[PDB]
């Protein structure tokens, strides 16, 4: 259900066994979890300017 | 972010430091003569 766009890379975040996604101070999604692999992935906005 | 961009300044800190050093040198070597000629 969580939709968006960006680049998916590997991060060193240590989530909890009951956490799904992560948010920052400005309340924007920057990290999710794989429902099939349970891997820590970070989301970065694509290039613009 | 969502369309917010910060523009860098034109003059770097090294140029401001050079300007300050030149002002100090002109003050300690000449005084008040380099400002009017």
Q: Checking DSSP bridges between strand A7-10 and strand A29-33, what pairing results, if any?
A: unpaired
Place of tokens 């692999």: A37
In chain B, breaks (C-N over 2.5 A) are found after none
- CA angle B3/B5/B10 to nearest 5° reads 160
Residue linked to tokens 């970070």: A42
Structure tokens, B2: 């969502």
CA pair distance A23, A19, nearest whole angstrom: 11
Contact assessment for residue A1 and residue A9, using Cβ atoms and an 8 Å cutoff? no
Resolution of the model in angstroms? 2.7
Q: How remote is the C-alpha of B10 from its chain's centroid? A: 11
Give the whole-angstrom CA distance, residue A12 versus residue B13. 35
């Amino acid at each position: 259900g969580l939709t968006g766009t960006g680049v998916l890379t590997k991060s060193n975040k240590k989530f909890l066994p009951f956490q799904q996604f992560g948010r920052d101070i400005v309340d924007t999604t920057d990290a999710v979890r794989d429902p099939q692999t349970l891997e820590i992935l970070d989301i970065t906005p694509c290039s613009f300017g | 972010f969502n369309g917010l961009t910060v523009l860098p300044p034109l003059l770097t800190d090294e140029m401001i430091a050079q300007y300050t050093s030149a002002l100090l040198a002109g003050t300690i070597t000449s005084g008040w003569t380099f400002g009017a000629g």
